[PDB]
Design a protein around this ligand. Structure first.
Ligand code: HEM
Length: 405
């Protein structure tokens, strides 16, 4: 279902990519998107899928568009338009200078000092989950670790019940990897129905949890309103449930196929941090965009006011003009260039949390289960969207090679 080409779009600029169902998904998600960077594709294309939008395909362009909030506005950051329209998360749906106050608050909750404080729990849960899997010789990494690990840590931080997971997760998924089961507005609404009561409760009887801090926070000298906290929390929620979760599966699928990368990390542990960055580059997974605030000519292409453009954070570090041999994982690169956690005034506040969770998982997994692989005859399937994922990841290992700690 391609939408009629608008009048201002040169036919030569057309490239019908479907961000929800790219063509060589079988090959891997990062690989399917990378088709955008082939010599035959102009740097800035127009796709007729999902109602029609621009896509920047190169690091240089994505970064410029990200810096440029005057022209490229966060008001409508999701594609399709209905989604972008219904999107009202804070701070993500705001441009500077407005964004800055809400960002300051979100930081109080997810920032550096919070991670430092939660560090021992993170390590505690990782080790527990792994040790529990270890003797089994087999898991579903996605359902067995990648989901529980990050989510339980978040539920804790947010002071929310683990029983709510199933429900919240379904709604979060609907927003990034739409299923057809519900529209974006419906999904946002159900999440909002959830939060409202909880925020109410915490405005009256404050805790020390994330939600309590948000609901009682100060923005621009005055007190945050209720709709405002609702909208911040809604974002924290998607960040908590949907990001780290997917990333670990990409990375673990990779480790499962690369004995030499595993070994490298085992003998030369000082490399984990470097390795983590390299995986964040190669297994980048978020794609959102911006809306034109006006007609603007960008790299000789005429953008019209109201046009949405997808600026795939995922594409930046996959760009050969940025990283030599991009599809190849090399823990010893002189420079790992990516925009995995975004660029401009919107940089991930939760990046520090995300990194700690990754680094712990690698260290702790490898310590106990040094040798593992993909289950024989399992076909790993990727999923595309705003946040890309792995459907399921069946692993196998010989318990005799594991190490209890
Ligand atoms: C692998 C992990 C993650 C990735 C790749 C990721 C990626 C990103 C991206 C690309 C953006 C910018 C979006 C835009 O410019 O439209 C963003 C923003 C945001 N992320 Fe994440 N994220 C991750 C984990 C987290 C976590 C764990 C949290 C918190 C629980 C979180 C919270 C946020 C917040 C609060 C913002 C908005 C910041 C602002 O507007 O200033 N993310 N993230």
């Amino acid at each position: 279902n391609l939408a009629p080409l608008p009048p201002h779009v040169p036919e030569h600029l057309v490239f019908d990519f479907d961000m929800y169902n790219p063509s060589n998904l079988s090959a891997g998600v990062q690989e399917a998107w990378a088709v955008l960077q082939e010599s035959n594709v102009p740097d800035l294309v127009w796709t007729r899928c999902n109602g029609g939008h621009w896509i920047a395909t190169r690091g240089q362009l994505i970064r410029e568009a990200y810096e440029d909030y005057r022209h490229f506005s966060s008001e409508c950051p999701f594609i399709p338009r209905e989604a972008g329209e219904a999107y009202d998360f804070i701070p993500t749906s705001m441009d500077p200078p407005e964004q800055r106050q809400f960002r300051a608050l979100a930081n109080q909750v997810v920032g550096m000092p919070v991670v430092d404080k939660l560090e021992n729990r993170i390590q505690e849960l990782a080790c527990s989950l792994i040790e529990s899997l270890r003797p089994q010789g087999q898991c579903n990494f996605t359902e067995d670790y990648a989901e529980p690990f990050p989510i339980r840590i978040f539920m804790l931080l947010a002071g929310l019940p683990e029983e709510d997971i199933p429900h919240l997760k379904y709604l979060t998924d609907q927003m990034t990897r739409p299923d057809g089961s519900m529209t974006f507005a419906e999904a946002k609404e159900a999440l909002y129905d959830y939060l409202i009561p909880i925020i109410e409760q915490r405005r009256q009887k404050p805790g020390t949890d994330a939600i309590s801090i948000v609901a009682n926070g100060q923005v621009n000298g005055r007190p945050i309103t209720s709709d405002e906290a609702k909208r911040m929390c809604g974002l924290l929620l998607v960040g908590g449930l949907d990001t780290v979760v997917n990333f670990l599966s990409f990375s673990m699928e990779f480790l499962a196929k690369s004995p030499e990368h595993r070994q490298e990390l085992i003998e030369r542990p000082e490399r984990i941090p470097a390795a983590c960055e390299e995986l964040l580059r190669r297994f980048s997974l978020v794609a959102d965009g911006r809306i034109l605030t006006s007609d603007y000519e960008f790299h000789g292409v005429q953008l019209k006011k109201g046009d949405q453009i997808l600026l795939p954070q995922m594409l930046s570090g996959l760009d050969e003009r940025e990283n030599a041999c991009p599809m190849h994982v090399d823990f010893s690169r002189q420079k790992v260039s990516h925009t995995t956690f975004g660029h401009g005034s919107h940089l991930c506040l939760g990046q520090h949390l995300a990194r700690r969770e990754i680094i712990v998982t690698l260290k702790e997994w490898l310590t106990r289960i040094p040798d593992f692989s993909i289950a024989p005859g399992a076909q790993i399937q990727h999923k595309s969207g705003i946040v890309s994922g792995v459907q399921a990841l069946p692993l196998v290992w010989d318990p005799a090679t594991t190490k209890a700690v």
